[PDB]
């Protein structure tokens, strides 16, 4: 069975590239980890940084999560990210997404032992 931290890495890490490679990056990447196996996730963000740099955020600025919980953390500085937002013309199995590359702070929810990221909360 997939652990929370594993699902996190699967859904949000893309250390192999520095930025979105084309305006079609989201379309390609959301197909790739069986990520759209059942549905077209409304919003999904990819972090173009080492896992070490992202797991490090759980020891940075403690913030409230958008849902009210207080196990969230904001990165000290900015990170290379790509925001994937589902668009109009989506027709499962052909999910359609807008690719948005930006240099931003990330907010993640952390848990466990080791204390790691398990959900992507926001990019600010």
Swiss-Prot record:
Function as written in the Swiss-Prot or TrEMBL entry: Endonuclease that catalyzes the cleavage of RNA on the 3' side of pyrimidine nucleotides. Acts on single-stranded and double-stranded RNA.
Subcellular location: Secreted
Name of the gene: RNASE1
EC number: 4.6.1.18
GO biological process: defense response to Gram-positive bacterium
Originating species: Bos taurus (Bovine)
GO molecular function: lyase activity; nucleic acid binding; ribonuclease A activity; RNA nuclease activity
Effect of residue 12 to A: Loss of activity
Keyword vocabulary terms for this entry: Disulfide bond, Endonuclease, Glycation, Glycoprotein, Hydrolase, Lyase, Nuclease, Secreted, Signal
Positions bearing carbohydrate: 1, 7, 34, 37, 41
Tissue-specificity statement: Pancreas.
Protein name in the entry: Ribonuclease pancreatic
Primary location class: secreted
Catalytic machinery residues: 12, 119
Phylogenetic lineage: Eukaryota, Metazoa, Chordata, Craniata, Vertebrata
Catalytic reactions on record: an [RNA] containing cytidine + H2O = an [RNA]-3'-cytidine-3'-phosphate + a 5'-hydroxy-ribonucleotide-3'-[RNA]; an [RNA] containing uridine + H2O = an [RNA]-3'-uridine-3'-phosphate + a 5'-hydroxy-ribonucleotide-3'-[RNA]
Sequence positions that bind substrate: 7, 10, 41-45, 66, 85
Assembly with partners or alone: Interacts with and forms tight 1:1 complexes with RNH1. Dimerization of two such complexes may occur. Interaction with RNH1 inhibits this protein. Monomer.
SS bonds (residue pairs): 26-84, 40-95, 58-110, 65-72
Record family assignment: Belongs to the pancreatic ribonuclease family.
Annotated GO CC locations: extracellular region
Effect after changing residue 119 to A: Loss of activity
């Amino acid at each position: 069975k997939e652990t929370a931290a594993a699902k996190f890495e699967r859904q949000h890490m893309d250390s192999s590239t520095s930025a979105a490679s084309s305006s079609n990056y989201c379309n390609q990447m959301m197909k790739s980890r069986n990520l759209t196996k059942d549905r077209c996730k409304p919003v999904n963000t990819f972090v173009h940084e080492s896992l070490a740099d992202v797991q490090a955020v759980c020891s940075q600025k403690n913030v409230a999560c958008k849902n009210g919980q207080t196990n969230c953390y904001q990165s000290y500085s900015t990170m290379s990210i790509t925001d994937c937002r589902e668009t109009g013309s989506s027709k499962y199995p052909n999910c359609a997404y807008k690719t948005t590359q930006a240099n931003k702070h990330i907010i993640v929810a952390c848990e466990g032992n080791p204390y790691v990221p398990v959900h992507f909360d926001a990019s600010v």
